[PDB]
Amino acid sequence: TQQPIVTGTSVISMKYDNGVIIAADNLGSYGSLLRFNGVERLIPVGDNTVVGISGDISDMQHIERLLKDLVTENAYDNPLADAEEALEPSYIFEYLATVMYQRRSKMNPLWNAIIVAGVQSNGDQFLRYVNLLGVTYSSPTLATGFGAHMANPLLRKVVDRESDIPKTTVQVAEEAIVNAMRVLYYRDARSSRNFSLAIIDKNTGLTFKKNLQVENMKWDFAKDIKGYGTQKI
Template sequence: MEHDPFRWGRPSDQAYGEYNNSIAHAGQQQSFPKMNTQQPIVTGTSVIAIKFKDGIVIAADNLGSYGSLARFTDVERLFPVGDHAVVGISGDISDLQYVSRLLEDLEIENNYDYDGHSLRAPHIHEYLQKVFYHRRSKMDPLWNSTIVGGLDDSGKPFLKYVDLLGVQYSAPTLATGFGAYLALPILRKVVFEEKDVEKIDEETARNAIKECMKVLFYRDARSLDKYSLITITKKNGVVFEKGLKSEEQSWRFAKDIKGYGTQKV
């Protein structure tokens, strides 16, 4: 068998003669068939978000993992768009960078003929849903899960999800990655149904998000204790907080565990 990446698994030329490459490249100018990324390499983990009566709170940590290696510790995965919207992205970092450039281009194009109307969360979500579904239909998906949050055209909180297949849904609390298993149960204790949103203030929503980020740091091996948090309200617009810490000296309890370090059991 051949072990060259472009000839992988083909019978040996010595046994069956030289492979006819013109068959594989019929109608193509390039030297080998077009290949698409089918597996994320550097990835970001959970994005979590919650609605409250005046807006939304969304958070994501700053880690880019190269497999199991915590390689990059300053990756920003929250992107404000317009005056009242934010996009949080998990998954492949290279595809995340591509999506962020699409959002920048969309914002620039919208500002060329500014008529007093800015991009809002529903417009951005609909655009991303079309992009993700289009790429999925080409069998070249963007390996990301995305949460779009902000205010809708009437000024009410908006929170919606879209993934690499173009699947979309809305809920008062959303999470991607391991956050869907570890953070959502905590957030749903605060806001379970849409009718509960009106009972929740900003401080309660922020505290729930901070608690979730701490739990994710402890329980998700691909997470970091440094994260970014964005709060969006009609009154204050987008408030972007960077470099937040889940908890100081997070592993201080380890010294009390028997068998840890130099302790004797």
């Protein structure tokens, strides 16, 4: 049993017709102190998987090393390490899910919420969640922390069920993700303007976008707002 110290906020994601998109901001909070401003919380594994992690950053860095070690280990005595016997998103998730549940079962959890986004060998989209309790679930859209409350409602308006996935293009999906990140920046006190976004497509592969910013923000209406009730000036 511990408590999270340095933390990362929401990770948001969704499926679209040819793959998955995942996004997370670049902040490492220290309570209410916005301490670290250049933290990458999306960690790619190979060219087919991106693991997005929220919660305790020290545990995130540990998980990052586990995934790095997983790639090294998979390559050992494996002539097809970059082909048929490469790591799948499903392998990476199942491994993490095993570790998470084992750690909670020893009453010493990795204090994280994790979303594994990727594309399988057969082109199938992979999107699944796991957290500090070892709880796992899949959905056309997935989000952690504040994202669950604010991003999911917006992303579910694009893909509300399984049959909406083939009707959703990468442009529409990315647009929805980017808008959700803006909404989170408006409303989550532990969010930052700077974020990373990763697209894993079955045709164009892994596109990793760094140093993105929330833009097109509405603030002008604030000038007319005065007092808290009766004040006119």
